[PDB]
Amino acid sequence: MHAALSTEVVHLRQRTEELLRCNEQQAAELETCKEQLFQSNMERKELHNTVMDLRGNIRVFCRIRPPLESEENRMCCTWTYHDESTVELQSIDAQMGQQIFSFDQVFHPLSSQSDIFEMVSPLIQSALDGYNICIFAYGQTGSGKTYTMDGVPESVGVIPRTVDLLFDSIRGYRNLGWEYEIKATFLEIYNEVLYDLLSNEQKDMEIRMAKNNKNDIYVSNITEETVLDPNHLRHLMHTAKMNRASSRSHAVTKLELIGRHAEKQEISVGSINLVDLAGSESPKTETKNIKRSLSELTNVILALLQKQDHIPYRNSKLTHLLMPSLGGNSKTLMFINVSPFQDCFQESVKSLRFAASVNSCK
Amino acid sequence: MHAALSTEVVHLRQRTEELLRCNEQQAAELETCKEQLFQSNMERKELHNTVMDLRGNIRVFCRIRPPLESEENRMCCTWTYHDESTVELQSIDAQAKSKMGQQIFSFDQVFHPLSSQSDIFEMVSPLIQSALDGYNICIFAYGQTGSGKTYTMDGVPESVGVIPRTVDLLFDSIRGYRNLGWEYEIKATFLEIYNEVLYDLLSNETEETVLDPNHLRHLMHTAKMNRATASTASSRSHAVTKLELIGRHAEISVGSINLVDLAGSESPNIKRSLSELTNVILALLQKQYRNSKLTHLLMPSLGGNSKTLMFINVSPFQDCFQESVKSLRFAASVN
Ligand SMILES: Nc1ncnc2c1ncn2[C@@H]1O[C@H](COP(=O)(O)OP(=O)(O)O)[C@@H](O)[C@H]1O
Ligand SMILES: Nc1ncnc2c1ncn2[C@@H]1O[C@H](COP(=O)(O)OP(=O)(O)O)[C@@H](O)[C@H]1O
Ligand SMILES: [Mg+2]
Ligand SMILES: [Mg+2]
Secondary structure, three states, rough: OOHHHHHHHHHHHHHHHHHHHHHHHHHHHHHHHHHHHHHHHHHHHHHHHHHHHOOOOOOEEEOOOOOOOOOOOOOEHHHHHHHHEEOEEEOOOOOOOEEEOOEEEEEEEOOOOOHHHHHHHHHHHHHHHHOOOEEEEEEOOOOOOOHHOEOOOEOOOOOHHHHHHHHHHHHOOOOHHHEEEEEEEEEEEEEEEEEEEEOOOOOOOOOOEOEEEEEEEEEEEOOOOOOOOOHHHHHHHHHHHOOOOOOEEEEEEEEEEEEEEOHHHEEEEEEEEEEOOOOOOOOOOOOHHHHHHHHHHHHHHHHHHHOOOOHHHOOOOHHHOOOOOOOOOOEEEEEEEEEEEEHHHHHHHHHHHHHHHHHOOO | OOOOHHHHHHHHHHHHHHHHHHHHHHHHHHHHHHHHHHHHHHHHHHHHHHHHHHHHOOOEEEEEEOOOOOOOOOOEEEEOOOOOEEEEEEEHHHHHOOOOOHHHHHEEEEEEOOOOOHHHHHHHHHHHHHHHHEEEEEEEEEEEOOOOOOHHHHHHEEOOOOOHHHHHHHHHHHHHHHHOOOOEEEEEOOOOOOOOOOOOOOOOOOOOOEEHHHHHHHHHHHHHOOOOOOOOOOOOOOOEEEEOOOOOOOOOEEOOOOEEEOOOOOOOOHHHHHHHHHHHHHHHHOOOOOOOOHHHHHOOOOOOOOOOEEEEEOOOOOOHHHHHHHHHHHHHHHH
């Protein structure tokens, strides 16, 4: 019947016209809501940045690790916590002035990995909002550096926790229209010489100005993996640590967050630089450059603090590598790891001595 | 053939199922968006608290009231909002931008004339829950007559304000300390001032605890009514409202609440209490009392270790311009 079809058409055009209409109102609401969400996050980002500014763009921490179940009769020095920020160490040698230092926070032998991450988590957000972060673990060998950054399968550290935070955040960000991409890169620094950790073929790399920014950095010939998913990253990390076989080398692991918002044509890029510094201990029993680097690094932070105008980042491979992350907007976390034992008293006092020169900068 | 019109019935069935799927697609994106937008608003407001708590012990909010349903003939000046906390006013006449032509001030928050009573109280909220943690909160209303002070502190039975709204939460909080055990006693109080002569909003010529939510809500409205002031018979009265609290774990958590509705800030009597409050306040901020009955009276639920809060009410009218600028100036001065 032609009349049936004719009637089904007229109805069809009716449902189509009603749907096109109701369909254009959603498009309209979706639009404003989109705009107000972008605008809202934007302010949220700024409100977050203010809080980071108020707690400090450069904060120093202290972490005396618990003693190992295998060597304990080496009477740990005498530790006293004058408050959750100030700590003092005395030696058990029967008779300097005193040895007391202030931090932004002090973690004792019972502070869990989870507890230290809580000092870092806020920064994973800043990196996602386009800021650069640097996280160091400074101290003598055996004091706690590696266990703090990487950790142990039994109890994980800063880096593994950051990746879980990253992917969880990144995943959520999608609901805002941001598509994030992570650039992974791992490297080492023995004698002012850079070594890639995702390859074996020796190749000479070097720090050079970046394409679209003479202020940014670029390491030529290094492996820069574009993370596919957390499996891909887990593979990369395990693979990295693999070839890392030391306490006289600087291990840097950089994750660069490239956020791309398509419909708003806005781009965001921040970076996390997790550094497992080399032993700060003094030579006893040739290690020229290792004392250079560490001092250069601690001088650049001290400069950054007193707002020194022209800073010589190039005076060292490391300080040159992290230069764009030691800049203005940047935030820097510094974990001073320490050993409780007697034999480390003088060494431990050396480490801690950075806490005084940091705030004496006022 | 004409049965060839089955071509269009088919072609249409698709457009139909097309716009149908596309209908259902936008409804999902729009649900996620409102969802996310709501998460993004919460975070923003909490970080905003952390910021205000991190810097000072005194918040300043600015509130611009919309034109009353009866003032379609009053001219307004040009208002400009640059942020959520930066507002500027420009006079209507040219010769006005001839002298320091830039009136722009910054506060912890600026409320548009279309801001709901709930939007306001939402900034105050964080301070009520703070009283049960031991502090002395202090809420103020400042501005000329016809600005929004009373409407903000109290409100209208159709639209409740801060003083009422607190109450609600004040309890919903105790319903939370009464879990493993803790008991509270709401010591309410109601007074006022006229010309340095304190009266009372309860009896006629006076602290009674509260043992019933609506009970507190009663002596509250009683006071509201006992507050018999039709316009300038209230242009010089300071409507204070003490509300001390105490709690012992079921070791006596003492807090407070000091809601105030100051007198018109514009030119007139004495009104020194204000020029006095200002000094007392700027001096506290400077961080280093009986010049007015007011200051002296609430000279403890202030000072150090107490979170205070001030509202600056303004009218969007051109004839108010100097008075407004006078009010923003003051606030800014705190700023
Ligand atoms: N906080 C800690 N808790 C438990 N073990 C720790 C802790 N810190 C360090 N260790 C132990 O120290 C040894 C090597 O750790 P680490 O301190 O990172 O060396 P380095 O200080 O040279 O980086 C390991 O046996 C590790 O388990
Ligand atoms: N934010 C507002 N929204 C709607 N009306 C308001 C607002 N603020 C004040 N008003 C109106 O202004 C009039 C007087 O209010 P109010 O500001 O309390 O005066 P005063 O500042 O002298 O105490 C009332 O009619 C009130 O409804
Ligand atoms: Mg190590
Ligand atoms: Mg009034």
